[PDB]
Design a protein around this nucleic acid. Structure first.
Ligand SMILES: *OCCCCCCNc1c(NCCOCCO[C@H]2O[C@H](CO)[C@@H](O)[C@H](O)[C@@H]2O)c(=O)c1=O
Ligand SMILES: *OCCCCCCNc1c(NCCOCCO[C@H]2O[C@H](CO)[C@@H](O)[C@H](O)[C@@H]2O)c(=O)c1=O
Ligand SMILES: *OCCCCCCNc1c(NCCOCCO[C@H]2O[C@H](CO)[C@@H](O)[C@H](O)[C@@H]2O)c(=O)c1=O
Ligand SMILES: *OCCCCCCNc1c(NCCOCCO[C@H]2O[C@H](CO)[C@@H](O)[C@H](O)[C@@H]2O)c(=O)c1=O
Ligand code: CA
Ligand code: CA
Ligand code: CA
Ligand code: CA
Ligand code: MN
Ligand code: MN
Ligand code: MN
Ligand code: MN
Lengths: 231, 231, 232, 232
DNA sequence: AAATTT
DNA sequence: AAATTT
DNA sequence: AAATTT
DNA sequence: AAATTT
């Protein structure tokens, strides 16, 4: 199996696998059962912003998710990523639907990593039809309105159930090194989750994986395109 | 009195005012009596690097100080800087000598601040004779070898005792705002502390202050050009 | 008198001082009489973007101004800024109105300067607060209204006033050139909203570089754009 | 055949294929026969810096190469890269030796590309590790030796070998131009150490931009710099 | 998040 | 750039 | 950090 | 750009 560290924006409570009873943000270390969660007032139809940060000094993975004119949700977990991730990784965005569904639209995505200095930075404020610096997996597409659609959306603009897709940055990323004084990363993305159903599902995740990571077979719904099972 | 938050590289133990019995790095919140310290193996004559980081999510001020081919020293303190600093500040470097002395040479200095986005970034890898974007206070000079000398150094290159000087970035910095989702800063500087005396003193500090801050009268030696007294 | 280098977005043709017969973008080297101009299809009430670039290798000051879904206007002029500007400068935005008027609203402003090893400065304003301590506001310029910078006077309902002039300068001096530098470069970007009830909106917005102690010249409303003491 | 745009630091004059009679810097548009060259006082055994710049407004590819306390060499060529390169490219460093030889050591490399609202990419290498997974190494190129990138073969005591060619390409494709972009720009910087026991060191280093699937052309040691399949 | 069961 | 060919 | 005092 | 002066 892949090695996955993720931040989940989980729109749907799967209480059978440890989700709290409300939409939440969570920190996922090699399991869909979040090591840490916080309540998230997801706003159907509104553009949200997610901010993820980590540095080798505090070794604390932190995320903040917000909408304009609303209180943020924030979650943090103390984890030494040198003990979890390989030295080289790919970074990406994942989303899924199940028997309930939602648009999982990404409007922008930026990432910065630094090791003390070697740096990498990318910013996408628009996605083109042929975005050669992204690896699209499963149902993910680019070019529609200059957005990245992680999960399948029909020609009438309706989201489809039982969909999964991911976008990974083409270049491997040097996320830690034994000889580094300080290492840090940050990621930012803006997203639009819309459901015509009473209940949106299943969520979006920022993730870091082994370089050769692929969607686990059957990872639609509550597995968010990240995990082969709910252990 | 000014409002000061600083990271001290304290070369000289002033045990009468709570310094530990060894050269240390410390986090100073409105007092020279550090809220937190760590042991620092200062290397007389060698170029060192200091890295300071803070963000509004973790509200943890952290510093790392290192030399090539040596173990780092690191110190962190949980502090909400919105409760300590004014919304607008100046950032700077301070150094002092007393009855013992050292060169307090800065080879480079960079700073970045971001509020969610408004950003400010400066980098100095060399200092010119007439560096109009620095406010030099007390004995601080620029232009000698392209370095910033925070404290007085005679024409034969010998450091002088009972010296204090500071360099502040000209523009005020927006360090926090009630309406910001995320706020962060980082600072990096490289430094050369040399003493021909058995004992170097007194140290270098990165500091953040009220915009109109000036060297407190008599703040040579253990007060590091930051505090009017040892309370 | 100040030393000024500017890029003008000139909404109003002052034919008596060398302006062409249409709204234009111009490069101004120590004179309101542009060394170079290009036709500019200014879109009343629409958000525009201006991009200014220079480097010590090409020694060409270039600007592009655009609106979404419309053709850009671009102008370039070969000038060695080492022979024109002092080594240390302030950078800023200026705007004016006269008999005719317009909102001179700035929604965002960013600047980067680098000298090569490397000295750099970068600022970005995507919002302006009521108390923007890293800006020097001159004349009628105000911040805080909808998070925007209003270079010239507007009323409580957002209606522009005539006979207005204001400027915003970045607080820190900028090291724009150095004789011992291998490469020096700058870029600036700003987004702007020029809106007018008038048949002919006036007078325009400029990005400028000046001596550090520059102030609005006395009487510099209307066609002088808050930059020049006269039309020479 | 690949599509190549390069800046050559050409240490060896191949007069039979249009090189001038001295070490030169050149701009190469789909040919080893530079569209433009300038004299280059290459300093055997000293660390040099190369700076390459381009933007879609001036459409001028410019380079500067310098050593500390010495006069720069600079070359520029007016070219619209939209008419030459594919929209997506890889960027890289190439070097070669032939009968004569030199170390082609890279100490650092950085690149920035931006399309305007804005898409950006930036990387910086100030050290190279033994397993540099975000570089595609081609031919003799190796990383890890003193934290440097060695584009061509050197021995365990650091002595250069003849008849060598290697390249390092950034792993991710780069969006170098787009028809709907207002402004597009790139810059690259690298520091290099060219050292030789030979009377005439050869053959040089190049920064290049290519089709994403570019490889060292067969036989491209010596004067072809690992870029061109022939001297046309 | 709102019924339906123990 | 230096030697050799024409 | 190394003496000098309790 | 439109009106008025020369
Ligand atoms: O505040 C709570 C509002 C949202 C919950 C309202 C509906 N809840 C609910 C459940 N719960 C049991 C979960 O099973 C549902 C079906 O599972 C499939 O679909 C989901 C969503 O796409 C996915 O996570 C699973 O992996 C799977 O594909 C109901 O049965 C019901 O109604
Ligand atoms: O690992 C420890 C090595 C360094 C200490 C060795 C010398 N210690 C020492 C002291 N301690 C008492 C402190 O007073 C010294 C004089 O104080 C003046 O000088 C210092 C240094 O510049 C400064 O912090 C003060 O503010 C003041 O200016 C001795 O008396 C002695 O010897
Ligand atoms: O074909 C497209 C437009 C052509 C020109 C239209 C000009 N209309 C116009 C003029 N022209 C004379 C210019 O000065 C008159 C007013 O001068 C004052 O106002 C302007 C604008 O604020 C300013 O630049 C000056 O400095 C001064 O304050 C008219 O008189 C008229 O109507
Ligand atoms: O006045 C300053 C230098 C002037 C030229 C000096 C050249 N010396 C020289 C030549 N010239 C003929 C060129 O080709 C000979 C060797 O060709 C092989 O080696 C080079 C260098 O590695 C390479 O560019 C080629 O592609 C080929 O591999 C001599 O024969 C000689 O000596
Ligand atoms: Ca879930
Ligand atoms: Ca002390
Ligand atoms: Ca005008
Ligand atoms: Ca050659
Ligand atoms: Mn969950
Ligand atoms: Mn201390
Ligand atoms: Mn004009
Ligand atoms: Mn050549």
């Amino acid at each position: 199996a892949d090695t996955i560290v993720a931040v989940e924006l989980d729109t749907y409570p799967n209480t059978d696998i440890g989700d709290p009873s409300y939409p939440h943000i969570g920190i996922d270390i090699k399991s869909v059962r979040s090591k840490k969660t916080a309540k998230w007032n997801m706003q159907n139809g509104k553009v949200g912003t997610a901010h993820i940060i980590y540095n080798s000094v505090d070794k604390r993975l932190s995320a903040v998710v917000s909408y304009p004119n609303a209180d943020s949700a924030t979650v943090s977990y103390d984890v030494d990523l040198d003990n979890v991730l390989p030295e080289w990784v790919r970074v990406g965005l994942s989303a899924s639907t199940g028997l309930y569904k939602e648009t999982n639209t990404i409007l922008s995505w930026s990432f910065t990593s630094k090791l003390k200095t070697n740096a990498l930075h990318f910013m996408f404020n628009q996605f083109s039809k042929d975005q050669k610096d992204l690896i699209l997996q499963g149902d993910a597409t680019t070019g529609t309105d200059g957005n990245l659609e992680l999960t399948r959306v029909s020609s009438n603009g309706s989201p489809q159930g039982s969909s999964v897709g991911r976008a990974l940055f083409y270049a491997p990323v040097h996320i830690w090194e034994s000889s580094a004084v300080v290492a840090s990363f940050e990621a930012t993305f803006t997203f639009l989750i819309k459901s015509p159903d009473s209940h949106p599902a299943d969520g979006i995740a920022f993730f870091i994986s082994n370089i050769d990571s692929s969607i686990p077979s059957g990872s639609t719904g509550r597995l968010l395109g990240l995990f082969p099972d709910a252990n």
